[PDB]
Amino acid sequence: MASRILLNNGAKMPILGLGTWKSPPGQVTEAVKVAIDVGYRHIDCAHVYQNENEVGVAIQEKLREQVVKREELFIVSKLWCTYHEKGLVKGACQKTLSDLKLDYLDLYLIHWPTGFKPGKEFFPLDESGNVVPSDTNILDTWAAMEELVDEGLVKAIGISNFNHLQVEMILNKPGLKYKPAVNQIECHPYLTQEKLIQYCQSKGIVVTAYSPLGSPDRPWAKPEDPSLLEDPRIKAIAAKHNKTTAQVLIRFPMQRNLVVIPKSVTPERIAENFKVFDFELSSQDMTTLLSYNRNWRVCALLSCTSHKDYPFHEEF
């Protein structure tokens, strides 16, 4: 199937990207260089991952070496929660641009709907541990994002971890100038997201699936948690197709018209993970993988469950 999907800003986005959350700063430059060498043209980044400088070193060498042209790359980053204030959004975007060594981003996302007190700490907590919110609302933050488009710093803006009523709030914003191009959400066979995906797609919002392999390196993993990569039912589908389990887990969202961003710092897996355009899951296989849903989340933002904009109390 086609390697890019068209966004509602008129640009095309590669449906397979490289994730960089938890990629160590001393390994991610090589990981991104290898990814671009073996075909990746989309890199998913974020300021809160604390490795954008090192990602940028890789992008800049491959541009300098003329392995790729800037127009052929699709670089994504995300506004962290402590920068939702109007007077802080441009500088947060410009810090990311400087670190990535870019003059524009292809896509910039609000990382979470929850704004936090600005300061040095990414998770400012009170005298009892609760996240300290900011009195920013989603709509003024969105307006700040819209200005970034009008200043040329980003080609597209979007959202991440927004539930459907939060997406709706932006779509119904008075004076809305640019619709979100993307909602990036967790999605895999144990969290299949059928309701939120259908909502977003019905509105021409492209969905990106994060943690598609179930994030086995997540810092809070527990031996007793489910494991997609070890699920014998998914291994059997892989075996049937003579592919790896990870390749089946990456092809699965692709066939739902999603974008997907598997993370690896291992050269062999970076290359393996891109070899997903040569096979097809049947509709039966797709329905079977959807049947594994258990509403299980990797990323539940547990420190923020009382924030007014916490996204995961709503069904979807």
Ligand X SMILES: NC(=O)c1ccc[n+]([C@@H]2O[C@H](COP(=O)([O-])OP(=O)(O)OC[C@H]3O[C@@H](n4cnc5c(N)ncnc54)[C@H](OP(=O)(O)O)[C@@H]3O)[C@@H](O)[C@H]2O)c1
Stretch near ligand X under the rule CB under 6 A, chosen from 1-9, 56-64, 129-137, 209-217: 209-217
**What is the rounded distance in angstroms from the CA atom of residue 166 to the CA atom of residue 169?**
5
Is 263 annotated among the ligand-binding residues? Answer: yes
Decide: 311 and 166 in contact? Cβ < 8 Å: yes
Q: Using CB under 6 A, which of 264, 289, 304, 311 touches ligand X?
A: 264
Chain centre to alpha carbon of residue 253: 13
Q: Using CB under 6 A, which of 290, 299, 300, 316 touches ligand X?
A: 299
Helices (H), 73-137: 86-100
- Taking the CB of residue 74, how many other CB atoms lie within 10 A of it? 23
Shortest distance, CB of residue 228 to ligand X, whole angstroms?
8
Shortest distance, CB of residue 297 to ligand X, whole angstroms?
10
User: Is residue 46 exposed (0-12), middle (13-18) or buried (19+ Cβ within 10 Å)?
Assistant: buried
Residue 74 sits in the site that holds ligand X (CB under 6 A): no
Shortest distance, CB of residue 66 to ligand X, whole angstroms?
26
Q: Which amino acid, one-letter code, is at 196?
A: L
Is 14 annotated among the ligand-binding residues? Answer: yes
User: Is residue 265 exposed (0-12), middle (13-18) or buried (19+ Cβ within 10 Å)?
Assistant: buried
Closer to ligand X by CB, 177 or 205: give it: 205
Is 133 annotated among the ligand-binding residues? Answer: no
Q: Which amino acid, one-letter code, is at 292?
A: Y
Residue 38 sits in the site that holds ligand X (CB under 6 A): no
Decide: 83 and 92 in contact? Cβ < 8 Å: yes
Shortest distance, CB of residue 105 to ligand X, whole angstroms?
14
Tokens (6 digits) for 235: 């291994």
Residue 230 sits in the site that holds ligand X (CB under 6 A): no
Tell me whether residue 49 is one of the annotated catalytic residues.
Answer: yes
Is 282 annotated among the ligand-binding residues? Answer: no
Q: Using CB under 6 A, which of 34, 157, 213, 237 touches ligand X?
A: 213
Shortest distance, CB of residue 52 to ligand X, whole angstroms?
12
Residue 157 sits in the site that holds ligand X (CB under 6 A): no
Stretch near ligand X under the rule CB under 6 A, chosen from 60-68, 86-94, 235-243, 268-276: 268-276
DSSP string, 27-79: HHHHHHHHHHHTT--EEE--GGGT-HHHHHHHHHHHHHTTSS-GGG-EEEEEE
Q: Which position has the token pair 């009195």?
A: 135
Stretch near ligand X under the rule CB under 6 A, chosen from 120-128, 150-158, 194-202, 259-267: 259-267
Q: Which position has the token pair 């119904």?
A: 172
In the set 40, 49, 83, 210, the catalytic residue is 49
Q: Which residues here bind ligand X, judged by CB under 6 A?
A: 19-22, 44, 111, 160-161, 184, 210-217, 229, 244, 246, 261-266, 269, 272-273, 298-299
Binding positions for NADP(+) are: 10-19, 211-273
Residues marked as catalytic? 49
Binding positions are: 10-19, 111, 211-273
